[PDB]
UniProtKB/Swiss-Prot annotation:
UniProt source species: Gallus gallus (Chicken)
Protein name, as recorded: Lysozyme C
Record localization: Secreted
Function, in words: Lysozymes have primarily a bacteriolytic function; those in tissues and body fluids are associated with the monocyte-macrophage system and enhance the activity of immunoagents. Has bacteriolytic activity against M.luteus.
UniProt KW keywords: Allergen, Antimicrobial, Bacteriolytic enzyme, Disulfide bond, Glycosidase, Hydrolase, Secreted, Signal
GO biological process annotation, one example: killing of cells of another organism
Active site positions: 35, 52
Domain C-type lysozyme: 1-129
GO molecular function (one): beta-N-acetylglucosaminidase activity
Lineage of the organism: Eukaryota, Metazoa, Chordata, Craniata, Vertebrata
Amino acid sequence: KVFGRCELAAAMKRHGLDNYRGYSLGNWVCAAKFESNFNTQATNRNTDGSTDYGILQINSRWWCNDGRTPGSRNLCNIPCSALLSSDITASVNCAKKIVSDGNGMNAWVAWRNRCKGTDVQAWIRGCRL
Ligand SMILES: [Cl-]
Ligand code: NA
Ligand SMILES: [Ru+3]
Ligand SMILES: [Ru+3]
Ligand SMILES: [Ru+3]
Ligand SMILES: [Ru+3]
Ligand SMILES: [Ru+3]
Ligand SMILES: [Ru+3]
Ligand SMILES: [Ru+3]
């Protein structure tokens, strides 16, 4: 599924990301925009052989199992395929674990490079939330 900007903002709020770990909803929408352009089916292979999955491009190196990332962990205890669903539950629940693990949203390199320190509230401007 490709979410609309406000559609995803609303969904993320429903799923408990609105100010999760002190990150305002706009941060999460911004991160999704640049990680996946709001497309739940996004995948991207990394140079180390791991793969990023879903709306928040969660990496098989640490967070999910895809059966083809030798030496990897599955710290969210999910198949990476769960992260491609039209329903964002699995992605959100795993993202909560990720953002709580020490580095906050710096875990998402596109968030650090494209969202951090910007007016992220712009990403939810106009949306019925
Ligand atoms: Cl933080
Ligand atoms: Na893994
Ligand atoms: Ru939902
Ligand atoms: Ru809010
Ligand atoms: Ru709110
Ligand atoms: Ru990545
Ligand atoms: Ru950990
Ligand atoms: Ru931990
Ligand atoms: Ru503003």
